[PDB]
């Protein structure tokens, strides 16, 4: 098996630089070109360049020229790609890439990817706000309630309901990265409106990077 | 100098059905093309190379064809494991991507709206949330209106993955205002447009 | 009648047995004398197809040059596969000689006489020979030195034009000299190369135009290498046993492609004792350079280019010097030859 294993996700502040590694195994490191590709969140793939292991030859596209640097370590079979002057729009998934087929550089094998998050924010616990059920959020005999997990950094947070007793009808939405550089998301659940009176609903939010735990009771 | 265009942008099919994805090359002259499968939160996987050649470990239901400008990727009988985003490739160029989606009968969103919490108001920021629950297809339009005035650039939205049980989607839209700005107005409404809805549904509340 | 086949070639040379120069010494033991009366038969109304990028003759020559260098240019220190090998490293006499590559019985070499043949495709004009012409085993990057010239037009060579990962060989139809000199008398590793600006820029202009023919008349731009080892980012070659590294920035000058920049072009150079071996085996350290005037005059007869990938809306095409193989050097000389089996 041909394999590329990259470093873990990195966090940087705008203007700083990042260095990403790609560890190759299962084939002759020297034999084939190494490429780098980036994927914007909810977007297509974009080629960043290729590198030759024997003599370090490099090719860059117009857009990434002057902003990207590719380096090699032949002795440990590890490739590097360094990205500098990081921007907010540089937040993406970066893949080191190589070719499985002999004599054809273009066919590719994909590394698991390295997420790069560019934010000026610093690690921070979330604010947790209740989404109370009311006449506005009640249709038929179904009511909706939830929690707003606002202004935390970095990812991820976990959300459960009634300590995990409530799983059916629960939707926890993917975090959105705000302009502040902080993440925010909401988690909702639909329940019988008749049960709002008797059954108590509590949301459990865990943000391990700041070890912040919050149980918030959502009342009508 | 070669650009790759994929069609359709989104493709919705039932299990066991044949699926065809089209890739067109601007340069007009080629004999080599690759196809890739990418699942959510996962690295891409090579399926086809040299236009019509299957990668090892790939099911026989996957086939590739095409000559010159146009190339096609076909699945003989769609399996639920094949649900993912597919890309074509020519040299350093990739297609925009096609998301294979499991087709269901049209379902209108259940719409709920949440005013900002009192506790949040203390912070100095007010968030209004609009929920579109369990709907299909994925396409949905949310517009925010404040005192019947259209809002833009002050809202963000997020969508869940297709539910493995009922193949519906859910959407959350958050409108963010300052406490002061929030209190300068009375009626807050998000307007939902979806093909399952005969006319746009408006959820609103009195501050 | 004949049929395509691969087989083990042998070499021939006019090496002198009394010579201590390392190419002479090697060829004396590894090669036979040349044929003074070589036969060449033109094959009437015969068309043969060639592919320089898939030609086992190239791979075989590389092996010889690797073998030659290994027993001739022992470094004081060699860094290979994580190991270090030490041995004596006296200064040597070094100056490439022409080597002919020849087929044994039951095989012969076909030669394409198409003046503008690009190294891939059909050749109408074919002559059979027992041996190739004498090819000097010049190891270099970016620029090909002391190698055969195009008979008629400048030829652009690439395994695939559309592909950007494939190295481009520019075959010059007219030599431009390189004079490199380490003066006898400061820094003993300081050197320079002088080129004629008027002559070179005239040639470079032509290469630009030739490239235009292949790329839909798009604008041709030259830039310095994006990165890599010094062996590729600089003009790298061996002169009188000393390993030279020459800056080529001045040679690929876009603005001169014209103002009064018709004068002598002087490239800044350094001699390096510690180098990356072109054999790909690692690093070697040599003794410091000999005293006095170290000088080699060489024709420029080829150029290695890599095209920038990802051109989109912009119609420009950017090219940068440097080839990605030493095998490409031999390829440029062997492009018109292939081995076939006789019935
Ligand atoms: C070294 O190589 C150079 C390139 O191979 C040689 O350069 C050339 O000299 C020739 C004639 O020997 C010129 O060819 C002529 O081309 C002109 C221009 O023709 C073109 O323009 C029309 C209209 O736009 C276009 O349709 C054609 O395709 C051509 O692009 C002709 O008009 C003459 O009739 C004749 O064919 C070359 O153009 C020229 N190369 C360049 C880039 O200047 C040079 O001769 C070689 N050295 C030696 C000793 O042979
Ligand atoms: C190889 O390269 C070297 C350096 O580029 C060339 O050397 C130069 O040759 C010239 C004349 O062509 C020497 O210039 C002359 O010097 C004499 C003595 O001073 C002077 O009286 C003349 O008026 C003229 O300036 C020049 O000094 C010399 N460069 C050095 C450092 O020796 C050599 O010519 C090149 N080989 C070829 C074939 O061009
Ligand atoms: C450098 O290039 C020159 C000129 O192209 C070579 O000289 C020609 O050499 C041939 C013999 O191979 C003669 O028949 C020609 O008359 C020469 N041309 C001219 C204009 O005089 C020379 O051999 C090359 N030097 C090398 C390879 O080291
Ligand atoms: C070849 O020489 C040129 C000029 O000495 C070098 O060019 C400079 O490269 C740097 C970064 O190293 C740029 O900051 C400068 O702007 C360049 N000078 C100009 C005018 O382009 C080039 O780096 C040299 N090559 C090597 C390998 O060092
Ligand atoms: C039919 C034809 O063109 N004959 C040519 C001849 O003029 C040339 O001398 C020889 C060597 O290049 O190649 C052949
Ligand atoms: C080079 O690649 C292009 C694009 O795939 C292809 O159309 C052409 O046939 C190729 N040329 C060769 C010699 O393979
Ligand atoms: C060389 O000529 C052949 C003709 O068979 C053509 O197919 C190929 O594209 C050409 N390559 C270059 C680099 O001109
Ligand atoms: C450049 O070469 C030309 C021949 O084309 C010659 O006339 C001239 O003397 C040379 N120029 C200089 C100043 O080196
Ligand atoms: C290009 O040549 C001109 C000489 O007129 C000079 O201004 C410029 O420095 C040159 N560029 C190089 C040598 O990189
Ligand atoms: C090119 O050949 C000439 C003449 O034999 C020689 O002096 C020169 O050093 C050679 N160049 C190289 C790089 O071998």
SS (H, E, C) chain B: CCCEEEECCEEEECCCCCEEEEEEECCCCCCCCEEEEECCCCCCEEEEECCCEECCCCCCCEEEEEECCEEEEEECCCCHHHCCEEEEEECCEECCCEEEEECCCCECCEEEEECCCHHHHHHCEEEEEEEEEEEECCCCEEEEEECCEECCCCEEEEECCCCCCCCCEEEEEEEEEEHHHHHCCCEEEEEEECCCCCCCEEEEEEC
Ligand 7 atom with least separation from CA of C120:
1
**How many Å lie between the alpha carbon of C149 and the closest alpha carbon of chain B?**
31
- Domain B106-207: CATH superfamily, name plus number: Immunoglobulins (2.60.40.10)
Please tell me which chains touch C, using 3 or more CB pairs under 8 Å as the contact test: A, B
Question: B62 vs chain A: nearest CA distance in angstroms?
Answer: 17
**Cβ(A118)–Cβ(A88) below 8 Å:** yes
- Asked if B113 reaches chain A (Cβ–Cβ under 8 Å), the answer is yes
Q: Do B46 and A109 make contact, defined as CB atoms within 8 angstroms?
A: yes
Q: Are A129 and B117 in contact (CB under 8 A)?
A: yes
- Per 3-state DSSP, chain C is made up of helix, strand and coil in percentages (nearest 5) of 15, 35, 45
The string of DSSP letters for C163-191 reads -SSS-EEEEEEEEEEEEEEE-----TTEE
Q: Is C313 on the interface with B (CB under 8 A)?
A: no
Question: Are C228 and A30 inside 8 Å of each other by CB?
Answer: no
Atom of ligand 4 nearest to the CA of C247: 1
At the second CATH level, the architecture of A121-220 is Sandwich (2.60)
CB C160 less than 6 A from any atom of ligand 6: yes
Q: What does the alpha-carbon distance between residue C264 and residue C286 come to, in Å, rounded to a whole number?
A: 32
Q: Tell me if A58 and C82 make a contact (CB, 8 A cut-off).
A: no
Q: In chain C, what are the domains?
A: 1-343 (2.170.40.20)
The Cα–Cα gap between C53 and C51 comes to 5
Q: How distant, in Å, are the alpha carbons of C67, C179, C287 from that of C292? A: 30, 16, 15
Asked if the C-beta of A131 comes within 8 angstroms of chain B's C-beta atoms, the answer is yes
For this PDB entry, the determination method is X-ray
Cα end-to-end span (Å), chain A: 57
> Is the Cβ atom of C253 under 6 angstroms away from ligand 9?
yes
Q: Which residue of C has its CA nearest to B94?
A: C310
A54 three-state secondary structure: coil
CA A83, CA A92: separation in Å to the nearest integer? 12
* Ligand 6 mutation pick, B1, B4, B28, B32, max ligand atoms within 8 A of CB: B32
Put simply, the chain B residues between 15 and 34 with a CB less than 8 A from any chain A CB are 32, 34
Identify which of C162, A28, C93 has the alpha carbon closest to the alpha carbon of residue B93: C162
CATH ID of A1-120, from 3.40.50.80, 2.60.40.10, 3.40.50.300, 3.40.50.12780? 2.60.40.10
- Please indicate if any CB of chain B lies within 8 Å of the CB of C37: no
Measuring CA to CA, which residue among A52, A20, A23, A26 is closest to residue A38? Answer: A20
Q: Which CATH number fits domain B1-104: 3.40.50.300, 3.90.1300.10, 3.30.390.30, 2.60.40.10?
A: 2.60.40.10
CA distance A17 to A2: 29
Q: How far apart are the first and last CA of chain C?
A: 6
CA distances from A199 to A163, A196, B174 (A): 14, 6, 27
Taking an 8 Å cut-off on Cβ atoms, the answer to whether A174 and B159 are in contact is: yes
Q: Reduced to 3 states, what is the DSSP secondary structure of residue A209?
A: helix
CB contact under 8 A, B92 and A129: no
Spatial neighbors of B202 by CB under 8 A, at least 6 apart, are: B145, B189, B190, B191, B192
CA distances from A23 to A33, A50, A73, A77, A110 (A): 14, 15, 10, 6, 12
What are the residue ranges of CATH 2.60.40.10 in chain A? 1-120, 121-220
Distance B2 CA to ligand 7 centre (A): 19
Distance B50 CA to ligand 6 centre (A): 12
C261 lines ligand 8 (CB under 6 A): no
What are the structural domain ranges in chain B? 1-104, 106-207
Q: Is C239 in the pocket of ligand 10 (CB under 6 A)?
A: yes
Rounded CA gap, C55 and C157, in Å? 14
Q: Is A209 left (phi over 0), alpha (psi -120 to 50) or beta?
A: alpha
Q: Please give the angle made by the CA atoms of C179, C183 and C187, to the nearest 5 degrees.
A: 120
CB spacing of A148 vs B117 below 8 angstroms: yes
By DSSP bridging, strand B85-90 and strand B125-135 are unpaired
User: What span, in angstroms and rounded, lies between the C-alpha atoms of A37 and A53?
Assistant: 17
């Amino acid at each position: 098996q041909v394999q590329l294993v990259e470093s873990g996700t990195q966090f940087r502040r705008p203007g700083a630089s990042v260095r990403l590694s790609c560890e190759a195994s299962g084939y002759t490191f020297i034999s084939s070109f190494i490429h780098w590709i980036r994927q914007g969140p909810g977007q297509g793939l974009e080629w960043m360049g290729w590198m030759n292991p024997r003599h370090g030859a490099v090719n860059y596209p117009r857009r990434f020229q002057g902003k990207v640097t590719m380096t090699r370590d032949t002795s440990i079979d590890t490739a590097y790609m360094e990205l500098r002057d990081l921007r907010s729009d540089d937040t993406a998934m970066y893949f080191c890439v190589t070719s499985r087929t002999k004599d054809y550089d273009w066919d590719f094998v994909w590394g698991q990817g390295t997420l790069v998050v560019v934010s000026s924010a610093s690690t921070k616990g979330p604010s947790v706000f209740p989404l109370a059920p009311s006449s506005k959020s009640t249709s038929g005999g179904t009511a909706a309630l939830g929690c707003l997990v606002k202004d935390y950094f970095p990812e991820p947070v976990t959300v459960s309901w009634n300590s995990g007793a409530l799983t059916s009808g629960v939707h926890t939405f993917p975090a959105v990265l705000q302009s502040s550089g902080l993440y925010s998301l909401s988690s909702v659940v639909t329940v019988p409106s008749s049960s709002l009176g008797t059954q108590t609903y509590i949301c459990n939010v865990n943000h391990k990077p700041s070890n912040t735990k919050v149980d918030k009771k959502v009342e009508p | 100098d070669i650009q790759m265009t994929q069609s359709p942008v989104t493709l919705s099919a039932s299990i066991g059905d044949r699926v065809t994805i089209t890739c067109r090359a601007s340069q007009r002259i080629d004999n080599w093309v690759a196809w890739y499968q990418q699942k959510p939160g996962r690295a891409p996987k090579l399926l086809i190379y040299k236009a019509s050649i299957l990668e090892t470990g790939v099911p026989s239901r996957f086939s590739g064809s095409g000559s010159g400008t146009e190339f096609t990727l076909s699945i003989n009988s769609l399996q639920p494991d094949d649900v993912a985003t597919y890309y074509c490739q020519q040299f350093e160029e990739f297609g925009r991507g096609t998301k294979i989606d499991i087709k269901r009968t049209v379902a209108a969103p259940s719409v709920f709206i949440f005013p900002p919490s009192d506790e949040q108001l203390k912070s100095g920021t007010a968030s209004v949330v609009c929920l579109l629950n369990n709907f299909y297809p994925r396409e949905a339009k949310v517009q925010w209106k404040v005192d019947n005035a259209l809002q833009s650039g002050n809202s963000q939205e997020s969508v869940t993955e297709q539910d493995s049980k009922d193949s519906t989607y859910s959407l959350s839209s958050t409108l963010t205002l300052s406490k002061a700005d929030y209190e300068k107005h009375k009626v807050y409404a998000c307007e939902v447009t979806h093909q399952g809805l005969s006319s746009p549904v408006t959820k609103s509340f009195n501050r | 009648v004949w049929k395509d086949a691969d087989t083990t070639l042998f070499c021939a040379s006019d090496a002198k047995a009394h010579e201590t120069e390392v190419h002479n010494v090697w060829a004396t033991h590894a090669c036979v004398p040349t044929d003074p009366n070589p036969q060449e038969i033109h094959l009437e109304n015969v068309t043969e197809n060639f592919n320089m990028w898939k030609n086992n003759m190239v791979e075989q020559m590389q092996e010889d040059v690797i073998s030659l260098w290994d027993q001739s240019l022992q470094p004081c220190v060699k860094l290979t596969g994580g190991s270090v090998i030490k041995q004596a490293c006296p200064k040597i006499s070094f100056d490439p000689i022409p080597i002919h590559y020849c087929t044994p019985a039951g095989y012969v070499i076909l030669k394409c006489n198409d003046k503008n043949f690009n190294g891939t495709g059909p050749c109408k004009n074919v002559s059979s020979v027992q041996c190739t012409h004498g090819i000097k085993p010049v190891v270099s990057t970016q620029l090909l030195l002391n190698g055969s010239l195009a008979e008629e037009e400048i030829i652009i060579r690439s395994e695939n034009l559309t592909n950007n990962a494939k190295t481009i060989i520019v075959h010059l139809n007219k030599s431009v000299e390189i004079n490199c000199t380490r003066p006898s008398n400061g820094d003993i590793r300081k050197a320079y190369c002088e080129i004629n600006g008027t002559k070179w820029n005239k040639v470079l202009k032509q290469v630009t135009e030739k490239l235009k023919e292949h790329f839909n008349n798009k604008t041709i731009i030259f830039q310095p290498p994006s990165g890599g080892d010094l062996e590729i980012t600089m003009h790298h070659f061996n002169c009188r046993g000393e390993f030279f590294y020459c800056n080529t920035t001045q040679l690929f000058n876009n603005t001169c492609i014209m103002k009064g920049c018709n004068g002598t072009i002087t490239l800044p150079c350094k001699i390096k004792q510690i180098i990356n071996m072109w054999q790909g085996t690692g690093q070697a350290m040599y003794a410091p350079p000999i005293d006095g005037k170290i000088n080699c005059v060489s024709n420029i007869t080829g150029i290695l280019l890599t095209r920038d990938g990802g051109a989109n809306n912009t119609s420009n095409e950017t090219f940068r010097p440097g080839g990605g193989n030493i095998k490409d050097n031999w390829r440029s000389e062997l492009y018109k030859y292939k081995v076939v089996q006789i019935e």
